[PDB]
Amino acid sequence: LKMDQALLLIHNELLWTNLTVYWKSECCYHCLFQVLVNVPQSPKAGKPSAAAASVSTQHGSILQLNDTLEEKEVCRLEYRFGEFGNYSLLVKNIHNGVSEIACDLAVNEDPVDSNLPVSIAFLIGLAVIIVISFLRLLLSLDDFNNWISKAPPRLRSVDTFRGIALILMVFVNYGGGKYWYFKHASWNGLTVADLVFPWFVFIMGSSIFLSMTSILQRGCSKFRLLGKIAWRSFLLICIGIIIVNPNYCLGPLSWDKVRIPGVLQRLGVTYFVVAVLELLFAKPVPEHCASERSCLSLRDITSSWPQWLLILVLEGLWLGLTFLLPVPGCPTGYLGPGGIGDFGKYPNCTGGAAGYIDRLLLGDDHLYQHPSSAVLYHTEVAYDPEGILGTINSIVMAFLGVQAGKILLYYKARTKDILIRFTAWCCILGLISVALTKVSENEGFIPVNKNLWSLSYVTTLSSFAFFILLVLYPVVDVKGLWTGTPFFYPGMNSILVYVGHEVFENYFPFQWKLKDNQSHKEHLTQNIVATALWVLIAYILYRKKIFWKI
Amino acid sequence: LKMDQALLLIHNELLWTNLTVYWKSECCYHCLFQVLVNVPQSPKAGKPSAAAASVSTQHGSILQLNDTLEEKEVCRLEYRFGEFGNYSLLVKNIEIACDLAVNEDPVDSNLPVSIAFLIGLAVIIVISFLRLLLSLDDFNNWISKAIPPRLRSVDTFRGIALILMVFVNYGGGKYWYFKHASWNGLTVADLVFPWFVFIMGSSIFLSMTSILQRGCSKFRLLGKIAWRSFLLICIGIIIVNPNYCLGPLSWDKVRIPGVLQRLGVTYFVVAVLELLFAKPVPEHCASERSCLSLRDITSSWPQWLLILVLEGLWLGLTFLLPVPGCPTGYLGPGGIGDFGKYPNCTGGAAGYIDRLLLGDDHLYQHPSSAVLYHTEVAYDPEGILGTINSIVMAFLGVQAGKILLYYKARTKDILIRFTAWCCILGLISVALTKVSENEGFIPVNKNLWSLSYVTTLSSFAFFILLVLYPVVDVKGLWTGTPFFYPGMNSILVYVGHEVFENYFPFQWKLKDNQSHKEHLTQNIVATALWVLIAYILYRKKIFWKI
Numbered sequence A: 001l002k003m004d005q006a007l008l009l010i011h012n013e014l015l016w017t018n019l020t021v022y023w024k025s026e027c028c029y030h031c032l033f034q035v036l037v038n039v040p041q042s043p044k045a046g047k048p049s050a051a052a053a054s055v056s057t058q059h060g061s062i063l064q065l066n067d068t069l070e071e072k073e074v075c076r077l078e079y080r081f082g083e084f085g086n087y088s089l090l091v092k093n094i095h096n097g098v099s100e101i102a103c104d105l106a107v108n109e110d111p112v113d114s115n116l117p118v119s120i121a122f123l124i125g126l127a128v129i130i131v132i133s134f135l136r137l138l139l140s141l142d143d144f145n146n147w148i149s150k151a152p153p154r155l156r157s158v159d160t161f162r163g164i165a166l167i168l169m170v171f172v173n174y175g176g177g178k179y180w181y182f183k184h185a186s187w188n189g190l191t192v193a194d195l196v197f198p199w200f201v202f203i204m205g206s207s208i209f210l211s212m213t214s215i216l217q218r219g220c221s222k223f224r225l226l227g228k229i230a231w232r233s234f235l236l237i238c239i240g241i242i243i244v245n246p247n248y249c250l251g252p253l254s255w256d257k258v259r260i261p262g263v264l265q266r267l268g269v270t271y272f273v274v275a276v277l278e279l280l281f282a283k284p285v286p287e288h289c290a291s292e293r294s295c296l297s298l299r300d301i302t303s304s305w306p307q308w309l310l311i312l313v314l315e316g317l318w319l320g321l322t323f324l325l326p327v328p329g330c331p332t333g334y335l336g337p338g339g340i341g342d343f344g345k346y347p348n349c350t351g352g353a354a355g356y357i358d359r360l361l362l363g364d365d366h367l368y369q370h371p372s373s374a375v376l377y378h379t380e381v382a383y384d385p386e387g388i389l390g391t392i393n394s395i396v397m398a399f400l401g402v403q404a405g406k407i408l409l410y411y412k413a414r415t416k417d418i419l420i421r422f423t424a425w426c427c428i429l430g431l432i433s434v435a436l437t438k439v440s441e442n443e444g445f446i447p448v449n450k451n452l453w454s455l456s457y458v459t460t461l462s463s464f465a466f467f468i469l470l471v472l473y474p475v476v477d478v479k480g481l482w483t484g485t486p487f488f489y490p491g492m493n494s495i496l497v498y499v500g501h502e503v504f505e506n507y508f509p510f511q512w513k514l515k516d517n518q519s520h521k522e523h524l525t526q527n528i529v530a531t532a533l534w535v536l537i538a539y540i541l542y543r544k545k546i547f548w549k550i
Numbered sequence B: 001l002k003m004d005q006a007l008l009l010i011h012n013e014l015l016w017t018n019l020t021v022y023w024k025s026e027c028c029y030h031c032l033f034q035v036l037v038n039v040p041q042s043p044k045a046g047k048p049s050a051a052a053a054s055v056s057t058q059h060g061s062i063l064q065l066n067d068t069l070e071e072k073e074v075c076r077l078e079y080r081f082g083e084f085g086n087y088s089l090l091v092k093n094i095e096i097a098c099d100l101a102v103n104e105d106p107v108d109s110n111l112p113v114s115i116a117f118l119i120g121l122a123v124i125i126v127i128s129f130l131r132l133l134l135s136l137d138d139f140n141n142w143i144s145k146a147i148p149p150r151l152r153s154v155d156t157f158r159g160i161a162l163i164l165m166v167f168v169n170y171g172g173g174k175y176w177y178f179k180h181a182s183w184n185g186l187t188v189a190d191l192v193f194p195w196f197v198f199i200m201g202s203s204i205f206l207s208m209t210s211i212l213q214r215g216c217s218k219f220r221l222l223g224k225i226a227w228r229s230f231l232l233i234c235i236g237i238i239i240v241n242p243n244y245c246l247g248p249l250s251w252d253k254v255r256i257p258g259v260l261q262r263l264g265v266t267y268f269v270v271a272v273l274e275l276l277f278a279k280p281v282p283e284h285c286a287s288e289r290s291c292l293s294l295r296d297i298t299s300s301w302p303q304w305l306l307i308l309v310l311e312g313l314w315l316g317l318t319f320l321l322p323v324p325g326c327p328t329g330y331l332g333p334g335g336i337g338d339f340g341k342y343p344n345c346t347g348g349a350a351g352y353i354d355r356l357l358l359g360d361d362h363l364y365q366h367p368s369s370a371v372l373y374h375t376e377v378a379y380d381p382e383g384i385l386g387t388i389n390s391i392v393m394a395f396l397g398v399q400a401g402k403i404l405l406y407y408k409a410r411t412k413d414i415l416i417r418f419t420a421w422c423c424i425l426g427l428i429s430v431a432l433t434k435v436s437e438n439e440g441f442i443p444v445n446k447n448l449w450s451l452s453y454v455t456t457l458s459s460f461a462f463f464i465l466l467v468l469y470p471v472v473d474v475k476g477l478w479t480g481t482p483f484f485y486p487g488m489n490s491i492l493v494y495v496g497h498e499v500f501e502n503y504f505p506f507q508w509k510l511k512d513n514q515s516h517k518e519h520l521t522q523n524i525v526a527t528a529l530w531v532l533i534a535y536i537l538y539r540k541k542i543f544w545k546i
């Protein structure tokens, strides 16, 4: 059995009734019952005929056994299979009247625990093991030296947040233990991997405001800063396209089969747009007079009214292009995954208008040929999560990060003001997300979606980032209870860490040949070791004062 | 027809004699005639039976048409086939001699591709670079308007070696002369590594004496040497040697030896040796020429003694160590080479030592002789036995550094020493290899890192330094402009081009993958882009050093 899969032997003892087994996962919102296996009728009385099936055990399993001769629901089962199980399913008619048919599912080999076979126990064990190995290696280095023979201040809270995002990104990009909740969700919903990129955009906006206002406060011509912004955005886009997006293990790059969009292209476009907007509408930062007061003081909001107006116009444009753009052969306002999703009536509608804009402007060949929904909804079209339409919400979230930077640097004298603004913004964005999503995964007006970069996705992740900053500012900056240790070294070497881990995805320290690739524990420990090694590399570069920028 | 292939239509008009075609290249010294195609008989008179065979057109082709019924020769053809030819071969009974004819004229693939196309491509690249530089500058101007020191000769030589290495590692147009030679002789790709070791030794002496003249203790320098060797070995093992496009690394199949492992081991050996036997550089005034002062050798007598002992050990292990199932003193390539009577003897003593110590799995699974001599076993060119000769060549580079540092004031002394050492090593190499590959006591061999190989390329490096010291350093007629930029970022360029072997600026999809012109253009563009990256880092004063 493969990893995250369970055996299922269906024993059909029905003499004169054929069966076919339809399997649909629980995460499928509106999903077609994909066929699983066909179990023929029993050739002789008392001798059932069986078939072997491998039902996925990532999350939930709905089985419908339909008679093939007459398509009627013989029986249904809603059971959550466990990894590496047996699950001998017997389909038979009750002997009381030989009319009612009931299928009972019994387990013979107990499931091999996957999600919680490791837990904090194995986590702390691996941490202790790697710490002991690091200490032994450090001591051995001293043995080969002495025992061989006689012989504008940086915040560090934004750095800690960026380091947390980088650690999560390195963990989930390498596989995240191949766990289903450490990878991007299949279309709708929120997972651990979906939190990383919006937090990076938020932190990018905050750092945009911080660096821009510091540069303008010391002194610089706005044309020089505009040139720096354009050069950095161009470098980010080019780095993405050249070294970050393509998978060069498959062959040389092709002029007609290159993925133009990507994480760094979206970051560069967002950087250019929001940084140029803020530089054009740039005002000096006032020094706050009162302390722990001025609740109605909205200077950081009212003083940026042109930026807010343009951001609201952009968001309205995104909403209009999403809920109103006429997509050929597709319902207007489509937010579904296509394929077998939404009952399979729109197989080639992955993304709706957001994906249609990409497939119309950048071409189908220049998109992401393996979207997150391809494994669950079996979508056949290429959808790029970092598309053109989602760049609007990327810009909106970058400007929300800029607003966080405005909050944190306008009220730099008073900490209570910063905390009040942070909690007010977090509450406002959380209320907006609750209104949009109706605290539901697949329901609501605009459900959370990384692939579409939905408005509610942006608001939810911005509320999460505001809460993270609320709990990271007094702890790290003001009170200094915890100078975030395993985080701020990547927080200062983010670009180099990202570029390296993309370039060095498959290298010996970061991944090696496993005893069994169909194991969650081995993949988890390998990914944790790789993330720890990247943190160690960032710490080493910090100790050597090597900080790559731009 | 693949690249470097030629079609051959063998028409068999003979009625009562079957024929088999045996093809052997001209580069092979003693190779078994590998089969090409068995041509059936002609069913009727005037209706020959034809078969199509693709003969390699890289260099030479010896065809032996034996009668498979009785194993007898009828006609032999020592013909040099041209690329993408037709080459209908007709066998007709006269005498039983057969004659060969050409139907489609072959493409030159050498003259038209690398005679004036090189100049054209250089002009196009220069025009494109200037246009790119001016367009960005004009756009910025339009918007703004509206609103001791390094030698540099060792650096130039290192940059030349780096450009050649980048060109030949990327493929070099998939040409046979830009690839590593098949177990003997010299090609353009066989010159980079020994020159790199020579420059490594020269820079070793330069840096050691520059640090020691500042009063730094020998222990700190020894620690730096050890750390640099360790870093080089680890980088070579992890980043450079393995191909990660095939899968994750496994300890069972990982290539322990390599270019950087050999460089690190030789660096540690020669640097520690010359640090232990370090002497201050004397001041030199004299007059005109020193007339064979020989101070740089009388002061290096014990390092020279240890190097000669190492060379004697290399010779003894190569020519005396009994390899089981293999003749003592074997230098051949195995496989079908040496008449195919030693199918698994690639390297002889050196390969046997590699397989005995590091194991068969931890070697180079694709030796350079695999394509031509059909070797089935794994041999590592950067093995263990060849490390002795790599150390010897690093010490020859150290000797060149001593030459160019002891007689710093007198340039005539440096030139005399360089030409004398080049002549001595050239005569030694001529005696060893008899100026003929595959013959002589020790033929020139990169895979074995032969003593004649070391002496030949050390004479080459001494001549290059002789022609680069006055021009670049003393006379100043040249500054090594396209070469000394990688001369300061050698390690960065090597590591990057190993990491970025297949990346868009350096590698892209080709319209005709089986074409020398397109591969040559892509490799030249990639090499020029690496030179441009080195120049950009030079402008930014970014010089990564271990």
Ligand SMILES: CC(C)(COP(=O)(O)OP(=O)(O)OC[C@H]1O[C@@H](n2cnc3c(N)ncnc32)[C@H](O)[C@@H]1OP(=O)(O)O)[C@@H](O)C(=O)NCCC(=O)NCCS
Binding pocket: A153, A154, A155, A156, A157, A158, A159, A162, A169, A173, A196, A197, A200, A201, A203, A204, A205, A207, A208, A210, A211, A214, A215, A263, A264, A267, A492, A494, A495, A496, A498, A549, A550
């Ligand atoms: C693209 C990326 C490098 C941008 O990072 P940033 O948040 O803009 O951080 P940088 O260090 O790049 O900051 C650039 C500017 O901000 C400044 N800055 C950064 N953090 C700061 C802080 N906490 N306080 C003040 N200034 C700060 C820098 O000093 C520089 O300004 P200067 O020119 O005056 O020195 C970063 O988001 C990244 O690495 N992303 C990885 C890709 C990704 O998002 N992947 C997720 C999908 S898998």
Ligand SMILES: CC(C)(COP(=O)(O)OP(=O)(O)OC[C@H]1O[C@@H](n2cnc3c(N)ncnc32)[C@H](O)[C@@H]1OP(=O)(O)O)[C@@H](O)C(=O)NCCC(=O)NCCS
Binding pocket: B149, B150, B151, B152, B153, B154, B155, B158, B165, B192, B193, B196, B197, B199, B200, B201, B203, B204, B206, B207, B210, B259, B263, B487, B488, B490, B491, B492, B494, B545, B546
């Ligand atoms: C070994 C390698 C790292 C370069 O080593 P090198 O030739 O010793 O050059 P480096 O530039 O590393 O030298 C280091 C020191 O040499 C000294 N040095 C180098 N060139 C010098 C010169 N021209 N004049 C004076 N001193 C010089 C300096 O002191 C320099 O700095 P440090 O002392 O502060 O370290 C590597 O790039 C190399 O030579 N080859 C790798 C590629 C290869 O072998 N390819 C084969 C393809 S088959």
Ligand SMILES: *[C@@H]1O[C@H](CO)[C@@H](O)[C@H](O)[C@H]1NC(C)=O
Binding pocket: A015, A016, A017, A018, A019, A040, A041, A068, A069
């Ligand atoms: C399924 O069973 C029915 C009767 O129960 C039979 O007619 C049909 O042929 C079967 N289908 C198969 C064996 O594919």
Ligand SMILES: *[C@@H]1O[C@H](CO)[C@@H](O)[C@H](O)[C@H]1NC(C)=O
Binding pocket: A022, A033, A064, A066, A071, A072, A073
């Ligand atoms: C199974 O049979 C039921 C009958 O009620 C039908 O509604 C359902 O669509 C069938 N499943 C499939 C996959 O056709």
Ligand SMILES: *[C@@H]1O[C@H](CO)[C@@H](O)[C@H](O)[C@H]1NC(C)=O
Binding pocket: A007, A086, A088, A108, A109
């Ligand atoms: C499941 O159980 C049955 C009997 O209980 C056994 O024959 C089968 O081998 C088991 N599955 C696996 C994968 O071993």
Ligand SMILES: *[C@@H]1O[C@H](CO)[C@@H](O)[C@H](O)[C@H]1NC(C)=O
Binding pocket: A347, A348, A380, A381
């Ligand atoms: C959906 O797109 C695929 C190509 O990806 C095509 O083969 C198929 O016919 C399309 N189906 C519909 C219903 O448009």
Ligand SMILES: *[C@@H]1O[C@H](CO)[C@@H](O)[C@H](O)[C@H]1NC(C)=O
Binding pocket: B022, B032, B033, B034, B064, B066, B071, B072, B073
């Ligand atoms: C071809 O025939 C000749 C006849 O003497 C023989 O020597 C030679 O070995 C044959 N070729 C091969 C490959 O055996």
Ligand SMILES: *[C@@H]1O[C@H](CO)[C@@H](O)[C@H](O)[C@H]1NC(C)=O
Binding pocket: B018, B040, B041, B069
């Ligand atoms: C020649 O080869 C052919 C194969 O096509 C075979 O049939 C024939 O018998 C051979 N002639 C001999 C062996 O004399």
Ligand SMILES: *[C@@H]1O[C@H](CO)[C@@H](O)[C@H](O)[C@H]1NC(C)=O
Binding pocket: B007, B086, B103, B104
């Ligand atoms: C070689 O020439 C013959 C006739 O001259 C032709 O039929 C054949 O196609 C040619 N070879 C190729 C590879 O085209």
